[PDB]
Amino acid sequence: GWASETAALSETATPQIDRITIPLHELAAMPKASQRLLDDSAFDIETW
Amino acid sequence: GGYLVDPQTSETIRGVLRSTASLRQIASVVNVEATSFDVLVDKTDMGS
């Protein structure tokens, strides 16, 4: 406002509000590995 | 301000009530652990 000393201040604006929807999709990978490798390949293929 | 307010969802997910009369009330149930059940019933009677 920058109100005066005797001004009888009125109502003022108030911000309009927006809502934004983050749809939260999914990201998937599926690698295949042979069990004859998983157990015979001393590197940890599971955690690799 | 419409976006600020969100409705209170529910307490549970309620469903349509469906009847529970099943004829298992008066019929005779048996606990069979085979592949079938064989009731043997003479279709006729003796003679005298």
Q: Is B1 on the interface with A (CB under 8 A)?
A: yes
The data reach a resolution, in angstroms, of: 3.4
- Which single residue is written with the structure tokens 């069979």? B32
Between CA A31 and CA A38 the distance in angstroms is 13
Asked if B3's CB is within 8 angstroms of A18's CB, the reply is yes
Between CA A19 and CA B45 the distance in angstroms is 83
Write out chain A residues lying below 8 Å of B3, CB-based. Answer: 17-19
Write out chain B residues lying below 8 Å of A17, CB-based. Answer: 1, 3-4
In degrees rounded to 5, what are phi and psi of residue A38?
A: -60, -35
Residue A3: partners with Cβ closer than 8 Å, 6 or more residues away: A9
Q: Is B3 on the interface with A (CB under 8 A)?
A: yes
